[PDB]
Amino acid sequence: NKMEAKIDELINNDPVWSSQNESLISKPYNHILLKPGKNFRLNLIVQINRVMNLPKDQLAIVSQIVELLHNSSLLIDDIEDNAPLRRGQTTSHLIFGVPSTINTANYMYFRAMQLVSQLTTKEPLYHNLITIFNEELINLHRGQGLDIYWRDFLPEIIPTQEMYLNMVMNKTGGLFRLTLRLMEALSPSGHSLVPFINLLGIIYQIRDDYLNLKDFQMKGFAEDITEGKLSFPIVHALNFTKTKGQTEQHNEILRILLLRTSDKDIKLKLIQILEFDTNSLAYTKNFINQLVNMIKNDNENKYLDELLYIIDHLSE
Amino acid sequence: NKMEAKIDELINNDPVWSSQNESLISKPYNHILLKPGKNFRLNLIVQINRVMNLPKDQLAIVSQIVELLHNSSLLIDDIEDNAPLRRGQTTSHLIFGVPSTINTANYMYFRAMQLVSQLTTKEPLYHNLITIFNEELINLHRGQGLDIYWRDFLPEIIPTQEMYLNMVMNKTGGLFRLTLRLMEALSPSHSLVPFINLLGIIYQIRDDYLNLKDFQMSGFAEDITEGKLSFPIVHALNFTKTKGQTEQHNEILRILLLRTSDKDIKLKLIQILEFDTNSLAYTKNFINQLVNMIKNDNENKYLPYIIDHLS
Ligand SMILES: O=P(O)(O)C(O)(Cc1cccc(-c2cccc(NS(=O)(=O)c3ccc4ccccc4c3)c2)c1)P(=O)(O)O
Ligand SMILES: [Mg+2]
Ligand SMILES: [Mg+2]
Ligand SMILES: [Mg+2]
Ligand SMILES: [Mg+2]
């Protein structure tokens, strides 16, 4: 009876959750917050707003939603990629464990979703905001899924440049489009900037792939090699070697990716194969320059001051 | 120019996603489907619909949402618990790897979310459905987080029975309340939430209980290998602390921290629970009392075979 009295009180009430329970499970997340880059993601949202003109308090909420998705996605990504470092610091899952980091990151996806309701009281608009949120998160996971499948089951599938670009459109375009589409839907204020934001996302991803090797060849650890990632330079090298009949090189690239090695000489041998044998580094540098010129040479404002600053710091 | 033309076509279109890409990404999920249990899940939904009377088409989508949430949460739970088996088969992360399984599980969470939108087009009711989905997923994660925290930080915090029960209301109550609450809002007809919470508690304590009991009557008692603060373990820890039985308290802690697969050591912890603290009998009794709260509910305060095959 005292037992049943306690049970009856428990089941007729909401679940008890304290501020202390809250702090305990936020550990994986608080750790990644110490990392910088939040001012650059905020700087993009700000330039875009000069076109969208959302009031500042609404923009603030869009910002928070996007920071949560972004940080949660990096927590998961580092587990998925087995990364030891992120922004010069030890990775959350190595500190608090994969179990807590996975649960916390997923918890934060749902807190971000909860924030959408603070953007309007209008039921029609709300529905659209949630649909955008849902769609681009579906897109993000589809892209990530392919990137991870290709890498983990290599050489089952050797992606082409086309396939790589479609995966980026889902993966990276997912979060870029999500921010921009929420803003365009909230705008109280010409043509959509989705194509432009897609382009920015592609430049962002390929430049990330490139610098990861270029910083190490010349700063960084070419950690993408250790991870075995089918990066833009690797995709070009794998397809170049196949096409030119460089069987031994094609096979050595695969073998090195499959070692998941941290040996600096082995990583440097692969990067020099990309520099002199396949010319994938030059191919990638020029491909990046051509994408950037599609904008810098966009006089007819077909895609489009502060535009450029953003494109040269797109690394942060 | 040919490169520019192709980039322009790419950026002006929706992201390319094919049926084959969908298949690749679904593999870790199709794997756990080969797991029976959908019928007992479906039967609970069917039986409850006799109070709610949702039209079949709507009931089917609620059922699909439930199946996705439950399957995805077990794909992730097995990674979190380093479980090698689920319903006798090899867990997905051991076959497809942890990276792919986490991502697929998460992708299905959002697929489930999308289906919510097909429950109704009425704008107010849609906000309500989404809020129910959002609230119960937050609860599930909160409870899972606390359960993992206690396990991974042991011995920093040893929960009490009360704290254990609040963790369960969040963790196990979440998917139970989520289903019930969705159906109650879609009903074209008292709340059955208290009863579904009670069902959830019985379900989690019985899960914890059978994991040790099935092993002792022959079950691998994986909860011990996992080192989790299950209901009988919580009882045993507080019992020994309270009776000032220091060495038994520490012995229980030492075994859980071993994360051991050794049958003989697992048995040793079960015999501490049987002979020293009498925790297994305390749990059998606790479950029976919760079940009686239902069998002796004559005024129908909670109610408007499932309770016996709830495991
Ligand atoms: O907590 P654990 O790790 O001990 C474990 O229970 C796994 C687990 C982790 C997290 C949540 C859950 C869980 C919560 C809620 C429901 C369920 N499963 S369920 O699919 O049978 C289910 C619950 C409520 C339902 C309500 C109405 C219709 C169908 C329902 C189905 C599982 C289980 P286990 O299988 O690993 O022992
Ligand atoms: Mg990464
Ligand atoms: Mg990655
Ligand atoms: Mg489990
Ligand atoms: Mg678990």
Account of the 3D structure:
Chain B: One of its GO terms (biological process) is isoprenoid biosynthetic process. Chain B: Its main location: cytoplasm. Chain B: It is found in: Cytoplasm. The structure is a homodimer. Chain A has 316 residues and is an all-alpha fold. Chain A has one domain: Farnesyl Diphosphate Synthase (Orthogonal Bundle), CATH 1.10.600.10. The first copy, chain A, has 16 helices and two strands. In chain A, strands 1-2 form a two-stranded antiparallel ribbon. In chain A, a hairpin with a 2-residue loop joins β1 and β2 (89-90). Chain A is globular. Chain A starts with a helix and ends with a helix. Chains A and B meet through α1, α2, α5, α7 and α8 of A and α1, α2, α4, α6 and α7 of B. Bound molecules: the ligand O=P(O)(O)C(O)(Cc1cccc(-c2cccc(NS(=O)(=O)c3ccc4ccccc4c3)c2)c1)P(=O)(O)O and magnesium ion (4 copies). Residues 41, 44-45, 66, 70, 73-74, 77, 81, 144, 171-172, 175-176, 179, 207 of chain B line the site of ligand B75. Residues 77, 81, 83 of chain A line the site of one magnesium ion (MG).
Secondary structure topology:
Two copies of one chain form a homodimer.
Chain A: H1 2-11, H2 19-25, H3 27-33, H4 38-52, H5 56-80, E1 85-86, E2 89-90, H6 92-96, H7 98-116, H8 123-152, H9 161-186, H10 194-217, H11 223-227, H12 232-243, H13 247-259, H14 264-277, H15 280-296, H16 306-312
Antiparallel strand pairs in A: 1-2
Helix pairs in contact in A: 4-9, 5-7, 5-9, 8-9, 9-10, 10-15, 12-13, 12-15, 13-14
Bound molecules: the ligand O=P(O)(O)C(O)(Cc1cccc(-c2cccc(NS(=O)(=O)c3ccc4ccccc4c3)c2)c1)P(=O)(O)O and magnesium ion (MG) (4 copies).
One magnesium ion binds near residues 77, 80 and 81 of chain B.
